[model samples]
Target: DLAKYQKDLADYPVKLKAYEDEQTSIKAALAELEKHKNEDGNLTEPSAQNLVYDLEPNANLSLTTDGKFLKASAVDDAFSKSTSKAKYDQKILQLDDLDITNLEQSNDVASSMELYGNFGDKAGWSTTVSNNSQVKWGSVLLERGQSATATYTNLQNSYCNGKKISKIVYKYTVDPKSKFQGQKVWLGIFTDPTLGVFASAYTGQVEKNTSIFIKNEFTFYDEDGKPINFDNALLSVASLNREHNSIEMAKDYSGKFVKISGSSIGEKNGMIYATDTLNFKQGEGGSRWTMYKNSQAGSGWDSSDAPNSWYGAGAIKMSGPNNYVTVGATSATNVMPVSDMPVVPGKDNTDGKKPNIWYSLNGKIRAVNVPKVTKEKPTPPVKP
Candidate 1:
């Protein structure tokens, strides 16, 4: 028995090699047969075995005239339109004669948009439907901060309605140092006529210095450039105002010497409008900072600066197209619609850049991205 087992072991290598040789020959034969076939998945040569297996004959296939090639059914799919689209499994079902149950849950093919397998349901829910076309938060129109530089005037005007803005310069008088309360204007009309764009020149409130911007009014239009015209200029605001109180000046008082009683500065009966300081510490409510368009300074300023904007025509009454932001004087910081606010993803200010528009979509915004501002690295501290 021992001798027999040893002989069997010695013969094992020869037996195994014989079986391998047969397998290799079989594979080579199969390769030769495959080469005989043309481009179509058809057997070019005949086989005695003729194993059709479970293949559905002529179901969605056909043979060529020479009977050596088979391809998509001679029906409409004859062109193998599968290369065109992909509603599913490396194939597209005929819209008119589709049988969802017949689709194979697989993801394999050559070119174009694609898919992967199915949900195992004959209805063929796509297991993975993707390509360059379907991806990312790309649909949202999120406008991010962009660090930029410009002249103060350019920055100031950046939020305006694109209409050219001109500076209006004039001089006036204030009596006793009085407060010029801040207010908004619409179409050049101040809400409070007393301290408004068209305030009563003589009876409106004031101070005892230069009246730089007291009851300012200018000829302008609305956000839509629609003329809400006025016979003349009206009042805007006065940063000099200390309190919302009526000014009391002694009647018949002489120039630059009018007596004032009721006022924000003090209880003095001197002159109110006589020494009108059109200029006062702005928004101290009088700190004398009347730069709504900080853009005028050539430096980026805070978006929360006082007295948001200058009320008048062409000032930023609104930003963006239709559903726009109310353009105040202080948007975009020195630009308005504060930086903290929804920054208007620029709307073709003629800068030759693609303007960003954030549209509502599926609880998200849809649009190309507004590249984030690559902030200029602050200049290194000067070496001592």
Candidate 2:
């Protein structure tokens, strides 16, 4: 046993095993290099550079319906979790109150002169203008078809029977000692056949801040100045807000004074004096007879008397200091800003109103156009 162990055996199995391991490791190293090689015959380092192996064009790439160039980066899966989440939670953020101090302080006198006329133009003070040129009140009713026209005609005949005027003449009277003094002017009334009402008035004054007051009374008389009882017409303010088909007469007389206790329409508390139209139907249930100023009237402005169910629908109709005189033109081009006009207590033009000329003017100022800038390529530096 000792002589056999002493004899040197060639150990070929061990040598063969070591050789096989060496070959396996060398093959693995060679295969790794081959996997990442480029066509340029350079050994590409694993972490050194980004490798581009394939250059095949994508078959799905196509132009959009609008003929815009399509790109691979723009193709996103519609059913992706991220897209779904974004759409499901989309919401509009409420905005904070606007800072009006700067705008209020800025000078708009020059712009005002350009858009309207000089400060001395028209009424000498800024008058409200219409924002919508296409939306004339006359045209609005006419476009409602024959039913509306017939109903309106009937109402006009009933409500404005005695007030309807066929013609109106203008006469100017001056009072040297009056506040208006040198600036006294007369207003001319224009008749509207369709409305049977005074559609427009025009006048000119020499100076600003001149107040004009005119009062005319018509009482049912027997061919004499003596008032009669049976045909006696009492002029009163028609509540733009009528209740139970009856006018809620105004009691306040604190504003510009005009009174009509005779057959013609009376001016009370800054209301324009005119004749009452008998053309209106009793409780016609139309938009015009609805309570206008009261909160319960439900036009737009917050009303203290409005019912819980009342909500604003569309543009609200409002008058100037004189309740009978419509403020702002119905035409788009003639509309003026509210800021330029006289202020009304407890009222803001920002609330809903059609042809909102004031809001439009403010919007115009907000959207001031900014100039565009062009980018140029940078120049390369020369070696010194």
Candidate 3:
């Protein structure tokens, strides 16, 4: 009996491997069925070892984190027709009497300018102009132990209609009293509802009485110079200690996608943090578009410093051509609808690189087909 038990134990490994292979095959078969269903819209019944499994149509076919189809053909289709610059322009065309804000010229900003931020000693942080703004706060100078943030919005000259913020030129001067100070400043904007591109100009202080003229610029546009206009968007800035600052907006900036330069400082002059737009897909491609309740900054700045929380655009859904539904932002994690998934804005990134959770985007259709079974007749009391 002991020997026989040993033999059985030795044979278990082979049996286990065979079972694993069989399971793999079964899973592959089911996946193949689902692929055909999604791509070709063919509903096929499934059975394994004479056991027919039940299947049905799933209207809300959620693409959870790491959830994907075998074919990825639907993903490709969704990519080509995803929200983009052309779609942005279309939205503008539908609106009546559009007024654009070319931020390059001071005249345009002067005519249709709206400023929003917290500039007082006891002010609060906010994403929208409606929430965070002190009446007559622009003149409030930020001294030591004091911090402030500002945003510019509603420049398109249309109500609730935000223009494509392709370019933002932020100029500021900071004269640190001491070298190697921790007086830092950040500049960014909401390219989407909740997602934004922000970077730091200087960190760890500068020379005493050395006037550092910093010019921080960011551009959000497609390859062909097309625009991805952001409605209810804002161009925001943050500073711990600032001598002076200037804000400019434009549809085009005629420069790199991201340019941060500071005069008198050689190496530490440009874009000390949040350097590139690669995470947001600066150039041509099918970009992941999702919405969030509030906005969050990308994981470019040091987690120890800078604001990570931000607002995301409303969860915008597009079904067929010209069929769209934009829902209010929800407290959901980043979810890419079809194309390659990216981080959803406002991810609780306390640890910077790690996102808390993930969910599927709203409004996805998946048709399922289950196997049909028929009752079998039985023969009884045959021959005597």
Candidate 4:
């Protein structure tokens, strides 16, 4: 009998259909709202009026939490200015972070790099250093023990003995470059020192080795294809020594871009080296720092920027570097399998009943006017 009740409920398809229809209607309404809402979820109509106050304009009005009336002007003023205040509090004032807005209009790649920073491989490295137009010097230091002196010469001799220091700098360049040319590049400097086989006159004891040193730099480009200035950037250096045999060196630069100013140099022992200067100059085709004219090449938009265009009478055409469109369709397929045999059970409507007879208090059957007892009522007597 219980199974029959369940069967009857399961046969109700109208309930399931009602739920599905409700979901479909809600989805359609949400799609419509998304199409008309702005980035901030405000109506797009520039001159729309507030519905609550028929005579009031909605241009500056915003929906309230209840969605029944426009928020007060005082509330809007406070909300709008909060973001500006937060940004000002966290602003970085360094020269490196300043937006080189003028460089966006430049005509030359090199000039653009010089002002905005470089892009591509060796992006942050100065073009002059990579081009062999300038020279750099640097030094490294190794810490052996408490009384040890840290210096590049000592590190080089111990780690890179018998190695050559020929051509310490490497560079990469970009082609078909835009005003923000050299926006992505990797630059590196390498060195080797020989310390294993040393010609000694009297003593034959081998000297202890030191650590190796390397200084690498890179640059980054923005969405608009401009170099991010390095003045506001920060730099960090770290070293690791394991098993008293291997040593690793690393450096992290903050901000987007920078150029090498100098290099490191020292004897076969520990010593400090000066940084090299990174010089940048305008590349060929004039400085990329010129103001852009509306009519200039690769600047203005034409029919390609629009969705529709008229090329001939009674004809609509789409023009651009590429012409293609995509449309989507939804479909549903029944996955239930077909069977030749009929279902064993169609429907059942029987209701199951359990024993409801109860003994009277005086051992005699009699009907009494009373409501059903529940847990909320007073406790009844238990078995004697």
TM of each candidate vs. truth? 0.14, 0.19, 0.15, 0.13
Candidate 4 residue-wise lDDT, 15-110, digit = tens: 556545645654565556445443221222111110010011111111111101112222122212322223223321111111222112223122
Per-residue lDDT over 45-125 for candidate 1, one digit per residue giving the tens place of the 0 to 100 score: 311111101111111111111101111122123112332234434443222122211121122111221111121222333
Candidate 3, lDDT over the whole model: 0.22
Writing each residue's lDDT as its tens digit, candidate 2 over 189-219 gives: 1111121111111111122222222222121
Q: Once superposed on the true structure, which residue ranges of model 1 sit more than 4 Å away at CA?
A: 1-161, 171-384
Off by over 4 Å in 2: 1-178, 192-210, 219-232, 238-384
- How displaced is residue 297 in candidate 3, in Å? 45
Q: How much is 55 displaced in model 1, in angstroms?
A: 79
Q: Give the local distance difference test score of model 2.
A: 0.20
Off by over 4 Å in 4: 1-212, 236-239, 242-247, 250-384
Best by TM-score, which number? 2
Relative to the true structure, candidate 1 reaches a TM of: 0.14
Span of ten consecutive residues with least summed lDDT in model 3 = 354-363
Question: Which should have the higher TM-score, number 2 or number 3?
Answer: 2
